[PDB]
A paper describes a structure:
Here we report the crystal structures of a novel transcriptional repressor RolR and its complex with the regulator resorcinol. The RolR protomer is folded as two domains, the DNA-binding domain at N-terminal and the signal-receiving domain at C-terminal. In addition, RolR is the sole TetR-type regulator that has been identified for regulation of aromatic catabolism. RolR is an all-helix protein and each subunit is composed of 9 α helices (h1, h2, h4–h10) and two 310 helices for h3 and g1, a stretch between h1 and h2.
The crystal structure of RolR complexed with resorcinol (res-RolR) has been determined using the MAD method at 2.5 Å resolution with R factor of 0.212 and Rfree of 0.245. The structure shows a “Ω” like homo-dimer in the asymmetric unit, which is similar to those observed in other TetR structures. Two resorcinol molecules are respectively bound to the two C-domains of the RolR dimer and the resorcinol-binding pockets are identical in both monomers. The binding pocket is formed by 5 helices (helices h4–h8) of the C-terminal domain. In the binding pocket, the resorcinol molecule is located in a internal amphiphilic cavity, in which a cluster of hydrophobic residues interacts with the phenyl ring and a hydrogen bond network is bound to atoms O1 and O2 of the resorcinol molecule. A number of hydrophobic residues, including Phe107, Phe172, Leu111, Leu114 and Leu142 from helix h4–h8, are involved in contacting with the phenyl ring, while residues Asp94, Asp149, Arg145 and Arg148 interact with O1 and O2 atoms of resorcinol via a hydrogen bond network mediated by two water molecules, W1 and W2. In this network residue Asp149 directly interacts with atom O1 of resorcinol, while residues Arg148 and Asp94 interact with atom O2 of resorcinol through water molecule W2. Interestingly, these two paths are closely connected each other via hydrogen bonds among residues Asp149, Arg148 and water molecules to form a unique recognition mode (Asp149-W1-W2-Arg148-Asp94) for binding with resorcinol. The results show that the binding ability of mutant D149A to resorcinol is totally lost, while those of mutants R145A, D94A and R148A are dramatically reduced to 8.6%, 5.1% and 2.8%, respectively, in comparison with that of the wild type RolR. It indicates that the DNA-binding domain is rather rigid in res-RolR comparing with that in apo-RolR which should be unsuitable for DNA binding.
Author numbering:
A (entry chain B): 24 to 185, 191 to 224
B (entry chain A): 24 to 184, 191 to 224
The structure:
Amino acid sequence: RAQKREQTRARLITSARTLMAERGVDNVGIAEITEGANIGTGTFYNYFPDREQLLQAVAEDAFESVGIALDQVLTKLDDPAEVFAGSLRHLVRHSLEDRIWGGFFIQMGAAHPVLMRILGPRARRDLLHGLETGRFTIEDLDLATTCTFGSLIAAIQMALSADDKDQIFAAAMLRMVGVQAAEAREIASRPLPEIS
Amino acid sequence: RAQKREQTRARLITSARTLMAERGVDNVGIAEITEGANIGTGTFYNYFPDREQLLQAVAEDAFESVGIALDQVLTKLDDPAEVFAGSLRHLVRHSLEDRIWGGFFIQMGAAHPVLMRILGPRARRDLLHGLETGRFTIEDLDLATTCTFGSLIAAIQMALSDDKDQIFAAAMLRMVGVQAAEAREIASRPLPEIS
Ligand SMILES: Oc1cccc(O)c1
Ligand SMILES: Oc1cccc(O)c1
């Protein structure tokens, strides 16, 4: 049935996440994942065409969780520049602390597309907000959104293979959207609201 | 000696580029490539472990050619901002007009590392100069250069799906501390022909 497939995909996603969180997205095979979901190994490809799709579902789950948490806290700040900066700083910190996250930004070339499906609409919103209040200067909204995540990935990959890294990165993104060079740094250094 | 091994590698690179420039990166296999280099299909793996390494070498060849060209023109301008902007615009224009380039950005996950090792040092140089001059405001030179290419890739991928090069360059200027208002002006000045 289609209902059986529905819950199995869900169980596989849960299995993959639990295992990768412990050992790394790169150190878990589908045999172990199918075991965790309680199904025959040779039956995996009955729910996912390949490994990548499953990886993407796990990444969506991770990014969406933070996205929702960010929408709960951050947006409650008045300065659009702080909302955007704070959001970015949380992503960077999560990347340097979550085993599974670091794995997404390195061993996954589809990180960008996933980030765009889940956090893109949120970032665009935050940027549009800053544009409407004259806080930001942006010529193309979609470009700023996609470049932000392209930069995030590169930024996290560098940091991972190496401290206010999050602050420095956020400042650069603030400057990219039209914030005075000196002001940007200050805004990216404001106390960061707890995300947990 | 293994000197022939080196010659073959070079011939394979030449073959892949010629073929991919006419048919597109994704429509050319080991079969066609080895044929252009005049060797058997199977012997391919005696020169490259995978098709991916050859693809990277072809991209290196294309990025280096433009890098060298830029080093002999753009760098002659007096405004560091315009040197950086113009260089980025050439990269965007090539990406949208050259069949082979489009393929590197939407058919190769190693785009960033290849760009970073060939153009990275060049962009970093131009950014440092602009930092010396006080034209830019950058806290971490490596971060700025790796972010520029991260952005370039994303920007090109989007475009590939009227003056997009100017807009991209302006945003990068803004990212490095250039006044939002004067950024678009600099990014719209006549572009010096690279070749
Ligand atoms: O959820 C997000 C992610 C990145 C930037 C932002 O403003 C919001
Ligand atoms: O060769 C390059 C490529 C991109 C930016 C730059 O300043 C130089």
